[PDB]
Structures are given as structure tokens and as C-alpha cells.
Design a protein around this nucleic acid. Sequence first.
RNA 1: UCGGAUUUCCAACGGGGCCUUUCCUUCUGGCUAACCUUGAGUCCUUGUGGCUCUUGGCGAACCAG
Lengths: 184, 81, 206, 129, 87, 150
Amino acid sequence: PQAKILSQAPTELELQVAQAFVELENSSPELKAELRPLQFKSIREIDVAGGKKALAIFVPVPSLAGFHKVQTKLTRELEKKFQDRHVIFLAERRILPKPSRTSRQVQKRPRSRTLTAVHDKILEDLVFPTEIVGKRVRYLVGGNKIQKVLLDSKDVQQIDYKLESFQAVYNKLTGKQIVFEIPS
Amino acid sequence: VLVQDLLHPTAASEARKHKLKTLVQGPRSYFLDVKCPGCLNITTVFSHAQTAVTCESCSTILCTPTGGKAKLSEGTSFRRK
Amino acid sequence: SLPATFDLTPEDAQLLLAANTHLGARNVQVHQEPYVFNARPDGVHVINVGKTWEKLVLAARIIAAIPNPEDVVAISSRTFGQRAVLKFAAHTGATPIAGRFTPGSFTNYITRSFKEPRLVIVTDPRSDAQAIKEASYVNIPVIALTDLDSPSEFVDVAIPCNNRGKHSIGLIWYLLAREVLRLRGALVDRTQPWSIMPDLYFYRFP
Amino acid sequence: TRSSVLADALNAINNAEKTGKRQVLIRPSSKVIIKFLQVMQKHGYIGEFEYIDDHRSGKIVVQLNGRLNKCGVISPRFNVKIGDIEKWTANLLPARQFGYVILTTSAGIMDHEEARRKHVSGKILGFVY
Amino acid sequence: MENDKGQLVELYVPRKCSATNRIIKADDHASVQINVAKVDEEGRAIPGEYVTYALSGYVRSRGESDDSLNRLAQNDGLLKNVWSYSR
Amino acid sequence: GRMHSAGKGISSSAIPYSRNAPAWFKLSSESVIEQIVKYARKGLTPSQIGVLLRDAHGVTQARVITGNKIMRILKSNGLAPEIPEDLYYLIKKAVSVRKHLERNRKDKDAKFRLILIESRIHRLARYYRTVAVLPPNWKYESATASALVN
RNA sequence: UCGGAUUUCCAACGGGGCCUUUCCUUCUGGCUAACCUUGAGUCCUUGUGGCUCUUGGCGAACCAG
């Protein structure tokens, strides 16, 4: 049921991922009990400068915690099957435009529906399960934003091999440049 | 004091500054899992408990509020967080 | 810009530990807490003698930078420093001013106490304070031998030692003397210890 | 209470330059402050600097090179028109040759010479030379 | 400063300080110029080749010229393990 | 700092940088919300409820573990009192000082402090009367205060 | 080239229309051009090529309310 777990739009790699996903359901009595209603929206394939590529799994919002129960073993199994594809979970957060001076009647846009909140949720989920312990934005002399992001010391090694992939993801989704660091 | 780093202070000197007056502010307190021997049970207690945290079953005051920190009862196991 | 030839010697480190150069002052100023290693529980701080050694190395570099060896002047109103400065300048070629500093020795181009240094070296910046203030008017660099509560006004390169114990003072002048002479070329080999004992720079009384 | 923030920021920058230091810590931060320091950084009265988040309102650490003589704010933000610039550049700058009275126009915050070139005007924040 | 012919029209270019990069003026007598001798492989000073530093009268008078010269020397590799950039 | 006095006292709680839930805390959101409702039907104020939740039950902050504050939850349950807590304690303290002045007619210091407290009441009541969390008919009066506290 | 002339290249300097989750939204009637149904002709390498009409629709524009 690879089109069941997809949503009205088949794509080649989406059918591959959903097929492997049903196969991972079949290798488990309880992971199938969670992952069978857990559908997902779409994918993005984007290459890194280290030879391989990465897959942003676009997941709907109100099921993301159930993924966060299970995304550890699921990213492990999907890094087993589809090699040289770094597995990333990103949610689908529709932004709203900022109203101009000639802006016909639209309701009070939530803070979550803004640009920067969605970018912050992106950075929250890119380094799941570890927590960003701080953001320090460095402004160069030529006026070039480099966002330094700090990471914890509990779950280093799960993300430590995925760093340049995360840089490529963030420089592709918005064009802003970013540097991760783990403090001593 | 002419050229120094304020982005990366030394952790010892940064450890002595006031709670509100660090680089990024944040608390100096913590939590505890305590066990009274009369129940063998984990009770979670904040380090600066303002009320007398009594155990679940027995009427044993596990900590008393005195100024800054709560004084633990005599004969009580504890561990942080 | 330094070979590993310049590094700290075990013999010199034994000397510096024997002289109580590490025993710093009780109270420490703001600008010399880099030089503190730690505070003993009796209230005496500990001076990083490796930092001290490399400060002597850089001071010896600066002393080597003056071409004519006469413009280097050593200064002491300290009693033990009188002995140390006299024997230093004897072995060096520099000129000494022991005891009381005549004011207007660096100003006042008429008088007989008029000297024109290009470097002033000071045992105690508190006891020789007027020499610092005099050097602050005619563009002279100042090398001082500062203890941990010594005032650092108008000073250049300052060496953390103990100005209380006479062994420390004589040994600091001793090591600076030998390192300057090794940098000159009269002490061609570096393996050679300086043959004159540090007892010649220590102060005596019958 | 604390009424202006760019004023306090330039106060601290100017005091640390008077003492000859290298860095400052500004608390809080603002968008206006960031744009102002970008205007400074474009001509290069300062080197690089850095935002710090604490979820409240950021702090800023500024590296300041040696080049700032004096910066300041004009605290009632006066409305200015185009020729009016020739008044304020006659008041605040040390010469006709350099110095930047900076304006807040509807096309952003920038120095007065760009607003000559873009042919806009607005309000006034401060002066840098 | 130059003219319209592109030729310079000043009396002298001032020396700037190194600790604070400000101008050492024609009568700052509390300022100081430092020479540190370039060494040989044997540890002999090269006679006519120095590394120079400029420490202005404000810098020196405030009580900072020691620490600042330590910083400048270790950043130019004349010291090591003395000046710590974090305090 | 410190209107109606002169101190520059800073003594407050910090707030940790972590927005999200604690790592070691392993209870349910509905569990702590039901605990809040239980303590509210016991008859406590949200300050007291937050204190008892971080002392006994290890619940650090209500907006950390749940998406709502304590006052949003008591408003969602129909347990919000008729006036907010701070105005209530100010009127309570004013009633205490008023009774003390009714006993002792000579304490000029209690008179001065009562004037300060009533000033603080009027400023905070203008704030609550602006944002429509209090009816515009409402006005602090003496016998009205004796009715509202006693 | 018989003092000024405008291409190519080059920095620059401001500006407009877009695309990146995104800027003026419609309903009802008239006005041009383009994709499609339908068969017809003028040109040239044999043309569903280019130029032009025939009844019915969609998209981008012009106007009214």
C-alpha cells in the first residue's frame, strides 16, 4: 500500500521509500502498529558536496510526535536500505505572506505562520533528537550572515556524520549560510 | 582587559557570576530524586523548595525551606535531577 | 619566532624554585592575574615561572635590541638590588644607578647627572617610582621586575617575581644577565651554564 | 526607565573606543541597531560583530577596530526633507569630505549620500565619523 | 591627502599606535617605540633587523602596555602560553 | 525600580534557554493538567499551583510541559476568579491596613503606606479596566473593598 | 568622423518585471491578439511552415459598471 501511505501523488523515489517503508512494517509487530497510520506527504532529493545525497521527508504536522517516538530506528533502517541518502524529517509548515500597505481583509496571521518561526522549526527538526543549545549569528565585514548553531553532548554521533548535509539543506531551502558547532 | 573574548568566557570565571548577569542568563538550581528509607520511593524535589515537601505515604518532611536551599531530612538518599 | 633552544632548563627551574620566585604577593592587582598560577591556602599566590622565564627571554631580546650597550640603564633604590644592579652592569656593559635616583637625570640637559638612555630597567616600580615617572617624559621604554601587587603604570615588559626575597632579586638579575650575554655572542654555546655563581649578585653584610 | 536603545548602544561603543578597547557587549538589541551597524560596517568604521540569542532580545558583541572617532544619535528623530540634509551635514560632520549623517527613509536606513543618490529622504537617527 | 594632480600634500604621515590604532602625535612623549631583536639559529640577535611596536601614551599611561605588548608578541609568535584571549 | 519606595533590588527567577520539555520528566500533559484542575478545585491561586508543581511533582514550568499557562487552563475550565490574583491581594492588604487604621488612629506611617497601596490599586485597576478584563462599572471604594474581601 | 556622433567591452550607480510556499481580488456585459474544433485560400525547400477567415471554448491583456 505504497499509494495509501502516499497522498494522491506518486513519485518514483516516493514509491521506493514507501515500498521500503511497508517492508519495514512487515519486519515488526509493533513498529507496524505505529507506522501504518503514520503517512507522509512528500520528498526532496538534494545532493551534498561529499559525494552522496539527502532526502527531506516532508511529513504532516499533527503526526510528527508519533514519528518522534520512532524516527531513531526508522532513520537507522532507512540508512540501511537506501545507501548514500541521508534521511531527514522536515514538517510541512505553510507560511503566510506579510501584509503590505494595500492589503485586503485577511485574519490575524499567527506567529507560527510567519517566515522566521517556520525556519526555526526547520532547524529544530533538522537536528532531531538533540537540542540546539544556542544560536549566535555572525555578521561578516562584507555583510554576510553566517548563522552559528550550537549542539548538545548527549546525542553527538547520530548527527556528527550528517553535518554538511544539513548545511546543504539549509542553504538550499532559504539560501542563508550556517555553521554547526559542538562546544567543549 | 583591552582585547579579550566575551563570546567564549572561561568556564570558571563564568561560573562565579550572578545568575542574571551571565553571558546568556539561566538558573543555578537543579532537581533531585530523593528516597526516604521508610518507603523506598523516588520523590522529585526542587533544590530551593519553598514548602515542606512531605513524602507520599508517610508524614515525613523530606525538606524544610530555609532561606535559599531546602534543608533535607536526616537519613535520606538523594541524587540529582 | 623562537627555537626550542630558548625553552626552560631544568637547572634554571631548580634555581627559580629555590629562590622562592614562585611565591607571589598576598594581594594581586587587576593587570597581573595572568601571571598568577594559583593561590595557596595561606594567602600567598603562585607565579607561573614558565611565563616568568619567557618574559625574561623577551626582555633579553629587547636589551639586545639596543645597539650601543651604554644606553641601557639599570635602576635600584632597593638595597639588595644595589648589589644585583652593580654586578649586572659590571657583567653587562650597561650603566647602573644604585641607591637614590637624582631627579632631572633624564631631563635637564645642563647638569652633570644628565644621562640619555634608550632603555631603563627597574627592580621595584614602587621604590623606583620616580624613575618610571622620569622615563615617562623623554620616550624611554621601561622594563620592571614586578611582584604581584606592583603598580603597572607606564611600564613595558614586566617580569613576575618576588621583590621581597633577596635570592629572587639576585637570581632574576642573574638570569637576565646571562641570557643577554648568551644573546650577544660572548657566550657562544647555549649548553654552557654561566660560570659565575648567582652568589655574586646576592647582597651581603659583615 | 530605558527609553532609547540605539542611544545606549552608541554610548557604550563610544565609551569603549575612548578607552581604546576592542569589543563591546550591547544589551538589548534591535533591528534598527543591526541595520545601523551594517551601515557602519559598510564603510568600515567597525570590523565584524555578532548577534547572541537568549530568546528575549539579543545581545551583541562588537569588534571595533580603531577607526571610529565619534558616533552618536539625534534623539528627537527629526523629519527632514532633501535640502534639509545640507543643514545637518553642515552641523554634525567635521568636514564636507567625509562623515555620514544617517537617515531612516521608507527605502530603508542608510547614510545621507546614498539618499542623495537614491533621491529620497525621511527621518534622522544619528551621525558617524 | 593629495591634490588634484594626485601628488601628496602633507608634511608627514603620523605614526599610529598598535594597541589602540590611534595616532601617536608629534609631542606624545609618554608614548614608546619598542624594538625586539630578531634571533639567529644559535640564539644570537641580528644587529640591524628588529620587529617594532608602538604603544601610545594613553595606552602606556593607563597601565596596559605590558598586557597589550604580551598580546602583540604572542600573536606575532614571540611569546607562547602567556596571553590568553579568554578571561 | 520599585515605585512607592527607593530600592534598586534585583532578585528574580531566571528562565532556562530550553523552550521544550525536560529530558528526565516523564509524565503526561493530561496528567499535569488534571493535577492543575485538582489543585484549582482545592482552591489555590496559579502562583501557589506553580510552586506546588515544581516542589512536589517536579513540574518545572506549566508552559514548558503543556502549551498553555495555568491561567489559560483555569479560564478554559470556568475556574477563573472574578478578579485576578494581584488586584485581590492588593485589596486584601489594603483591607488589613484599613482595619489597622480603624483601630489605631495615630499611625501616620500606616496612613502613608495605605495611600501608596491605594495608588498601586488605582494604577493596576486602570490597566485591567482598559483591556476589558474588568467591567467599566467597577471602581475601588472603601465599603466596596470591605464587601470584596470580607 | 567631417568640436561632438553611437555600437562592443568594462566597472559602477540607482530602477522595473519575475521565480524561489508570496501581491490587487472578483462578477456581469462589450474590444484586440494567442492556443484549440472546423474547413478554405496567398507566398516559398513537398508543410498543422509563415500570411488570412469560418461556429463553439481556455489563458494573458483593453474598458465599463
